[PDB]
Design an enzyme around this catalytic site. Sequence first.
Site, PDB file in Angstrom:
ATOM      1  N   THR B   1       7.068 -12.409  30.277  1.00  0.00           N
ATOM      2  CA  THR B   1       5.964 -11.514  31.030  1.00  0.00           C
ATOM      3  C   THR B   1       5.262 -10.242  29.957  1.00  0.00           C
ATOM      4  O   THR B   1       6.273  -9.540  29.115  1.00  0.00           O
ATOM      5  CB  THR B   1       6.855 -10.500  32.165  1.00  0.00           C
ATOM      6  N   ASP B  17       0.224  -9.918  32.530  1.00  0.00           N
ATOM      7  CA  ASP B  17      -0.220 -11.365  32.187  1.00  0.00           C
ATOM      8  C   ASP B  17       0.143 -12.017  33.742  1.00  0.00           C
ATOM      9  O   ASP B  17       0.366 -11.741  34.530  1.00  0.00           O
ATOM     10  CB  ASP B  17       0.856 -12.019  31.142  1.00  0.00           C
ATOM     11  N   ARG B  19       1.680 -15.388  33.677  1.00  0.00           N
ATOM     12  CA  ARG B  19       3.269 -16.391  33.316  1.00  0.00           C
ATOM     13  C   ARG B  19       4.429 -16.294  34.220  1.00  0.00           C
ATOM     14  O   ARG B  19       5.121 -15.435  33.912  1.00  0.00           O
ATOM     15  CB  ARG B  19       3.166 -16.568  32.249  1.00  0.00           C
ATOM     16  N   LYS B  33       0.809  -9.964  38.913  1.00  0.00           N
ATOM     17  CA  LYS B  33       2.178  -9.547  38.282  1.00  0.00           C
ATOM     18  C   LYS B  33       1.923  -7.557  38.773  1.00  0.00           C
ATOM     19  O   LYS B  33       3.351  -6.536  39.079  1.00  0.00           O
ATOM     20  CB  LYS B  33       2.585  -8.985  37.070  1.00  0.00           C
ATOM     21  N   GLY B  47      10.919  -9.393  35.267  1.00  0.00           N
ATOM     22  CA  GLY B  47      11.866  -9.510  34.743  1.00  0.00           C
ATOM     23  C   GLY B  47      12.378 -10.690  36.000  1.00  0.00           C
ATOM     24  O   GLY B  47      11.674 -11.298  36.571  1.00  0.00           O
ATOM     25  N   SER B 129       9.166 -10.071  27.948  1.00  0.00           N
ATOM     26  CA  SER B 129       9.679 -10.555  27.234  1.00  0.00           C
ATOM     27  C   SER B 129       8.542 -10.767  25.527  1.00  0.00           C
ATOM     28  O   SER B 129       9.165 -10.311  24.730  1.00  0.00           O
ATOM     29  CB  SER B 129       9.977 -12.148  27.232  1.00  0.00           C
ATOM     30  N   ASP B 166       4.341 -14.467  22.880  1.00  0.00           N
ATOM     31  CA  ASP B 166       5.266 -14.494  23.429  1.00  0.00           C
ATOM     32  C   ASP B 166       4.801 -16.004  24.142  1.00  0.00           C
ATOM     33  O   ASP B 166       4.136 -16.469  24.812  1.00  0.00           O
ATOM     34  CB  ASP B 166       5.414 -13.304  24.873  1.00  0.00           C
ATOM     35  N   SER B 169       4.664 -15.729  28.211  1.00  0.00           N
ATOM     36  CA  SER B 169       3.999 -14.559  28.428  1.00  0.00           C
ATOM     37  C   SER B 169       2.358 -16.237  27.936  1.00  0.00           C
ATOM     38  O   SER B 169       2.988 -16.190  26.942  1.00  0.00           O
ATOM     39  CB  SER B 169       3.276 -14.024  27.932  1.00  0.00           C
TER      40      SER B 169
HETATM   41  B1  LIG Z   1       8.137 -12.751  33.540  1.00  0.00           B
HETATM   42  O1  LIG Z   1       7.854 -13.698  32.625  1.00  0.00           O
HETATM   43  O2  LIG Z   1       9.163 -11.797  32.618  1.00  0.00           O
HETATM   44  C1  LIG Z   1       8.194 -12.804  35.453  1.00  0.00           C
HETATM   45  C2  LIG Z   1       7.647 -12.135  36.385  1.00  0.00           C
HETATM   46  C3  LIG Z   1       7.177 -12.282  37.494  1.00  0.00           C
HETATM   47  C4  LIG Z   1       6.683 -14.384  37.805  1.00  0.00           C
HETATM   48  C5  LIG Z   1       6.139 -13.690  38.559  1.00  0.00           C
HETATM   49  C6  LIG Z   1       5.833 -13.486  39.909  1.00  0.00           C
HETATM   50  C7  LIG Z   1       5.941 -12.276  39.219  1.00  0.00           C
HETATM   51  C8  LIG Z   1       5.667 -11.104  40.157  1.00  0.00           C
HETATM   52  C9  LIG Z   1       6.259  -9.362  40.278  1.00  0.00           C
HETATM   53  C10 LIG Z   1       6.727 -11.304  38.205  1.00  0.00           C
HETATM   54  N1  LIG Z   1       9.629 -13.715  35.681  1.00  0.00           N
HETATM   55  C11 LIG Z   1       9.267 -15.202  35.239  1.00  0.00           C
HETATM   56  O3  LIG Z   1       8.966 -15.711  35.165  1.00  0.00           O
HETATM   57  C12 LIG Z   1      10.993 -14.906  36.504  1.00  0.00           C
HETATM   58  C13 LIG Z   1      11.741 -15.821  34.746  1.00  0.00           C
HETATM   59  C14 LIG Z   1      12.266 -14.884  33.912  1.00  0.00           C
HETATM   60  C15 LIG Z   1      13.184 -13.825  33.525  1.00  0.00           C
HETATM   61  C16 LIG Z   1      13.025 -13.269  32.749  1.00  0.00           C
HETATM   62  C17 LIG Z   1      12.158 -13.267  31.418  1.00  0.00           C
HETATM   63  C18 LIG Z   1      11.763 -14.244  31.609  1.00  0.00           C
HETATM   64  C19 LIG Z   1      11.582 -14.936  32.115  1.00  0.00           C
HETATM   65  N2  LIG Z   1      10.642 -16.364  36.589  1.00  0.00           N
HETATM   66  C20 LIG Z   1      10.766 -16.581  38.442  1.00  0.00           C
HETATM   67  O4  LIG Z   1      12.144 -15.849  38.672  1.00  0.00           O
HETATM   68  C21 LIG Z   1      10.455 -17.379  38.662  1.00  0.00           C
HETATM   69  N3  LIG Z   1       9.632 -18.538  38.497  1.00  0.00           N
HETATM   70  C22 LIG Z   1       8.764 -19.217  38.905  1.00  0.00           C
HETATM   71  C23 LIG Z   1       9.056 -18.423  40.298  1.00  0.00           C
HETATM   72  N4  LIG Z   1       9.897 -17.975  40.837  1.00  0.00           N
HETATM   73  C24 LIG Z   1      10.398 -17.046  40.190  1.00  0.00           C
END
Ligand SMILES: *[B]([O])([O])[C]([C]C1=[C][C]=[C]C([C][C])=[C]1)[N]C(=O)[C]([C]C1=[C][C]=[C][C]=[C]1)[N]C(=O)C1=N[C]=[C]N=[C]1
Lengths: 199, 219, 236, 213, 242, 229, 230, 214
Positions: B1, B17, B19, B33, B47, B129, B166, B169
């Site tokens: 993110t 972003d 992703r 997000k 997160g 990240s 990243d 991201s």
């Molecule tokens: B980001 O890359 O940190 C992202 C934040 C995010 C993602 C989707 C929707 C929202 C709405 C608030 C926020 N987090 C993720 O991609 C996380 C994994 C993660 C954790 C820490 C650092 C980098 C990545 N992914 C999930 O929790 C998840 N992925 C897909 C579907 N459900 C959950």
Amino acid sequence: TTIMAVEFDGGVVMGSDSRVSAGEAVVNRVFDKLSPLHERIYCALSGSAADAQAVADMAAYQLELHGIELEEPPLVLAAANVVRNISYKYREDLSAHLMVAGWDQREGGQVYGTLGGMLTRQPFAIGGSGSTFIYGYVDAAYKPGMSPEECRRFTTDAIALAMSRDGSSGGVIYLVTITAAGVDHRVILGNELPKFYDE
Amino acid sequence: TTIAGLVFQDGVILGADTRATNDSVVADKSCEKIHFIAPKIYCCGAGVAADAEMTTRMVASKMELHALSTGREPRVATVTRILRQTLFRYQGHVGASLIVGGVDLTGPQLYGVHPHGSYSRLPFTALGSGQDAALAVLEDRFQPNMTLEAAQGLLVEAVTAGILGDLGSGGNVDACVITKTGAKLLRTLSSPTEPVKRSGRYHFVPGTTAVLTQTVKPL
Amino acid sequence: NQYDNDVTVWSPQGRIHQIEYAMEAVKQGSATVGLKSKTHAVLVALKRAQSELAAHQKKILHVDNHIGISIAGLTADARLLCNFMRQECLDSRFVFDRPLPVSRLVSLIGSKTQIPTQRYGRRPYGVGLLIAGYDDMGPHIFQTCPSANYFDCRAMSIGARSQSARTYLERHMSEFMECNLNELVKHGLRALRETLPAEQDLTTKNVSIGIVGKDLEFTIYDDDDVSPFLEGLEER
Amino acid sequence: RFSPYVFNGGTILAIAGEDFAIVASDTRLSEGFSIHTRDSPKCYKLTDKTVIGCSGFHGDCLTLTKIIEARLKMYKHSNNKAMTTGAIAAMLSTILYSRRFFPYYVYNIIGGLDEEGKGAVYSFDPVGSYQRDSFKAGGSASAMLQPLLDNQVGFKNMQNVEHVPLSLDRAMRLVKDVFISAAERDVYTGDALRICIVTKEGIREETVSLRKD
Amino acid sequence: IGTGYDLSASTFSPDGRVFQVEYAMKAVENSSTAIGIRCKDGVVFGVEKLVLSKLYEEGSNKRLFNVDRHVGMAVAGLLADARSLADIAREEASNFRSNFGYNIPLKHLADRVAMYVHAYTLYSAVRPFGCSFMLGSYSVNDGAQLYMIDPSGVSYGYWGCAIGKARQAAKTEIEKLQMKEMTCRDIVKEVAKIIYIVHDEVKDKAFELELSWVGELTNGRHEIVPKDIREEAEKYAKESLK
Amino acid sequence: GYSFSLTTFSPSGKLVQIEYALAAVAGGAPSVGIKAANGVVLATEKKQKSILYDERSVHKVEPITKHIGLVYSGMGPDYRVLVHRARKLAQQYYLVYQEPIPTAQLVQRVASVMQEYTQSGGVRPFGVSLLICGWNEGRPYLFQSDPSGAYFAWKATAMGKNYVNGKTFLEKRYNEDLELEDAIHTAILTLKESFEGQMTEDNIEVGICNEAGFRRLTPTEVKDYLAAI
Amino acid sequence: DRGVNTFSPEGRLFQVEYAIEAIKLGSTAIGIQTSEGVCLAVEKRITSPLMEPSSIEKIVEIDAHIGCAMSGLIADAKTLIDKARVETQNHWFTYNETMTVESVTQAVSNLALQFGEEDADAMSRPFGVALLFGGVDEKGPQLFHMDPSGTFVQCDARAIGSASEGAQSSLQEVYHKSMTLKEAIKSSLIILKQVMEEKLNATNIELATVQPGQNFHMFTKEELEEVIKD
Amino acid sequence: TQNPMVTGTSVLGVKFEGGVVIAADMLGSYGSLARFRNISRIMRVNNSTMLGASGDYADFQYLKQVLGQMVIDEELLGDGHSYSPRAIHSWLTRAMYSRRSKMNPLWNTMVIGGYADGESFLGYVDMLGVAYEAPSLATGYGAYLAQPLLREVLEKQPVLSQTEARDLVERCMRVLYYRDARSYNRFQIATVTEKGVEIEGPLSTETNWDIAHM
Ligand SMILES: *[B]([O])([O])[C]([C]C1=[C][C]=[C]C([C][C])=[C]1)[N]C(=O)[C]([C]C1=[C][C]=[C][C]=[C]1)[N]C(=O)C1=N[C]=[C]N=[C]1
Ligand SMILES: *[B]([O])([O])[C]([C]C1=[C][C]=[C]C([C][C])=[C]1)[N]C(=O)[C]([C]C1=[C][C]=[C][C]=[C]1)[N]C(=O)C1=N[C]=[C]N=[C]1
């Protein structure tokens, strides 16, 4: 972090650097670590940011209601005991040190240490990761009977000396002068810091 | 993110972003997000996606009960406090890193709230990240009192640097501008990757799949 | 009429009738006398028999090595109060390794028994005690009541016909401090016998004695152990 | 990590005779290679016919001792009589097993008279298993003294030997000689030997000296 | 008003009164008189402690208590309630030091304890305290302070105060004194004189005088008036009566 | 507390405390609700005792969430309890289902709390009857919840002082096909039937609900409605 | 109405006063303490030939050396009997010994004024029962009486129940401290025959004797017939 | 406290004819760092008893608070009864054992000195509830350095005057300053006699470094 407090005739001087880190990463480079607990009572924050802010929020709350019940500004000893008790009760779960200094009608300007739930009055005191490298300096540079200006100069020099040596310390030096008249806020920018041997 | 914030002459800009990653695999190419708290308060989450989703939802709901009772526009200090005291109580187990931006009677404000419950009031910030790529762009070109056009431009660049630098991201740059008169949610304001084209000839002739059983339920 | 039912109800006279009704339990228990000299604290009590075939009820109970009591009133409440006292004493020796100061024990009884006088659906204790003890302040005689009030006494008598016994203790009060054990106990017996009917005298069956002092731990004398003391009595 | 236990050493021993019971102990208290005090006897008088020897972690020794003392008073108040040696032993087993999951690090040996006026010894493990014995050793030099008690007091491994029961004089001489051997070889045993003798007449205490090193 | 409106503290009467509190106030009025006087360098307490029996010890039923090292309490009313309030007051002072690290200020203690009293004036579940009491204290910072709390939970600060049978009669006698300019040694003699004057030798039996004081003379510590000074004040009190 | 019920059945079979709570409602200032074809109106008498009262300080017509609104007859302080509870209940639904709470669903949840105070120990029933309006599934809703915990879906109704007359007046005066602009006018005329004095934009309170959610009309909007009356 | 813990102007709890009156309605039972053992006897008060006489157990064994005679509300007694049996076995477990008759009587007695409404965990009223504890310990044969006030006393001879006044009067005229257990059983049976409306028989009454070296014994119908013969 | 922070080193104690003397440096160390070189580690409990404490300072301050209040509590009664030094030692043993049993010890090793009814008192209590009385005590590293010197003198002469006891304690503090790497040349000497508790400070023992020239 490098925090510092110095007692003088009409009150105290408190200082801090401005660095908030997360590992080797500077998260905030302009944080003010001198948090007010009451009008004329402040604390200098160090250690876990979350723990330090939580203790300060609770201490300011407890002291606000305490002050309104006594129909008087709380004593700096009462504010020091307030912080101290929280830090002591939760010493296994907290990892923060909140130095407490300020002014009273009774005992005037006083500086307190709260390290791990203990309580100690000091003519001057230092804290945070940066304090480790300025013990010898503050031991050589401190002289009793310092004016508020001399206290600000002692605090600025000691914190700049630690900021240079400590990776977890840096940025700007925030100064605060608590006196009967009120509180003065100074900021010494990273451009205006005192200079010493840095090679 | 890569989530980012900025405080310009007439308000706040929030960038994010699109992703969502599930262990080096892109699960969602376009998630949202930037979340609503109040009409003039928005929050970026980074997160654990469920933790960011639910802690944003809970504080938005608490701010509706707040505003209904008080009869006033909510303050950004209230959302910061409600969030911190909740996160601190969980001791970092609720993994939401948030960028709260908004406008109240006391002007525009930008805050960084971390999973353990610590916070900072900042003129610009970046979390996730890809925060370092965004924080480099912000440090390199932030000047106070930027114009809306200048601030949007810098924010897009800050999120974009994280999108390309990243691996955690990607996608598009979503943005939100908050001013004294309200908020403009600019979804997919920028798309650093041009529409992906393939020469897809993956058609299967009806009947190619071997079917063993077939039941039809009319509705 | 309506101010009789609960301890939480104050009568329009500033009186609590339930407390007064509980005190009537003490006045209806058989007479007990407690008195003290410069070295000893004595408890002398009359034991009633519920028939010729039944035995004379235990009026004197042990609390600790330095404390003993005599009861008047609800025997079940007396047992409740006795076990609280015994336990408070145990706590003090466990924690501090020293006897619980007698006046301190009595304060805990007053604090403990006041609680149900101010709580709805609760009732005061229907027990009045005479406490005999010895500590760093010498010997003591205390009096507790169903009203949570307590008294430090030079001598005392609670129960049925206890007014007659009180009169003897007031008239002979001056002789008590310089009294020896045999004489102090005899003074107690004479006050006890003044409550007794004109046709009735003291007996190695209805008399009970408890002694605590400078060298003696709290000891209870009941039948043939009581005989040496009764062998001095001489009149009316 | 904090450990709630420490080993303070010391040796206890009891012998049940025809009309007597001896409970004996050294007076040393230590920790590591240090001596806390040289006047720490491990014998505790419970009733005029029951004595107890306690050894192990001193914190647990002091506590279990005050609890036993308090429980006897409670029993006296409730039953208007002193606890017999057997009732104290049966009770101590329940007190020790009440700490089955956080034990009292104490080795207990009760010694006194039974309801026939004979000698009674009851030996326990930290968790509450006990039995009546003719004699027993416990504490740091337990394993040095136990084989000699088995031999000289139990007549074990001796054929064609007259089984004369032990007298108070002869048992007292044996307690004095075994603690001298325990003090020579066990670093935790020494300074002095405190002996408690229980008879119809009551308890006597004798204190003989052992090596200061 | 005996129509059910007076059986509970959670019940107001039609004229807006809480009779359970008024009946509890009557228990104090029926009791022996206690007086307290605030002067230039401290606070002094005096109590008419009626001798119910010649059998009781000298000093039995002490109506004067140490609530803290610097705070004293003078009671009038149902003694077991009065002693239960002394324990509350004590714990309140104890909890202030544990919280803030210094001696509880007297107005603050008066405020805290007065609200534990107030609490018992709102419910059918509990009974109001049949007691009124005074708190005295002296420090350089706060000066001399005398407060009084009644069964209703009301707390006021006083220059002079009396509670019990002769509350009004003792008040017209304390009013004659110019206490704002007097010492505790001077005011002790006067407290005894006022207690002997308001005592009823005909209706009441013999009495014992309890005297306590906290001031500059005691270094801010609540003490009993020593035997020496008490005998001197009782001699003046009897000599003034003639 | 008191663990026993304070509302019990009389020998004739009536829950008399609920009957007495309804009397508190029948003596309160009048309120009106009218379900138009494209919306809902809520109108009430907000006449205070003197000029000294700051009319603008407290409200009778209150929002619950973006699409639900409320009005009452009876005990003012009791109403506030139900308003907070209703707003809370509406957030609990939104937190789980991520959809605005249906008006029937809010009314049912709130009515459950009202029933609770008729059976739970040591409490009296609420002395309030609520008129609840909402907009969901593209259609308007008008409900009423009374002190027993019973709810009713109305096309138009009146509560409080002179409700029998207002209810007959509403039945004959207007029917289906009402535009919301026509319905507001009718609600104010229903109120004018009981009102003692000159009816101004400071002594009456109106709220509307439509496609755009629920909102309280401004005094300037009420003034223009009163310009035609 | 008034609370269950309300005192009468005389100093007695109304509920305890009324619980004592309930005992005046129960079957008459007698206990006699002799140098050779304690004797317990009780009238069953059978109301129908269809009722099994064996199913009325008004004399129970608490332990091998202790027995109990009861009167009043038979169901209230069943709770206290179990509390007594549990007590003896918890004492046996903890201390490896038997309890004295007095210790058992005191244990049951502690549960007497343990009733109330406000501030409780949870008996609403007292037990409408009177008990006689006859047994043998180191102090010899002991017989104890207990009532709903928690007051327990040691008795040479005691009668409880409907004809308590009359049976005690008869006991008083015939009891001597040197009387044999044979004479104790005979007197109890003669006194029991006198007070009952129905005639006495081996299936109409219960008799139990506790003697040192013999333990607690419940007399059989064949044994009761032999006793009634004399 | 599972992990101590600011700690105090040895606390010394020795009874003499007419009272008891206790000694302790005024240092609080954070590991090897002499962080607080002027904190008192001795406390007057009441007129007959005094306590010195080794280990964690925050836990010592807490006990000083709890004890201090207990004394105030007693004094309000004014009944002619007061905690003997032996009663404070008994309470403190139960206090340490109780915390140890909840697996949350108070990280201290304390020495209690007293004088009641012509009798001198000296008792040791540690974080586990190990308690005992002795003619001389030495906590921490002092059990290895100072206890052999106290016992050496008490072997020759078992009854010491107040002056002999005082000089013996000064000799022990000099050794501790030379040998204990967690000590400081700043200490207090507290004495309890018929008159009551007297705490003296700050004191320092003269040092000799002629061995450097060898
Ligand atoms: B980001 O890359 O940190 C992202 C934040 C995010 C993602 C989707 C929707 C929202 C709405 C608030 C926020 N987090 C993720 O991609 C996380 C994994 C993660 C954790 C820490 C650092 C980098 C990545 N992914 C999930 O929790 C998840 N992925 C897909 C579907 N459900 C959950
Ligand atoms: B300082 O270095 O101790 C600093 C002090 C502090 C106290 C209160 C509030 C803040 C900012 C919100 C800062 N604390 C930190 O920088 C710590 C890291 C640290 C701690 C101890 C020594 C060196 C560094 N920061 C955090 O804990 C934190 N900050 C941001 C994100 N996550 C955690």
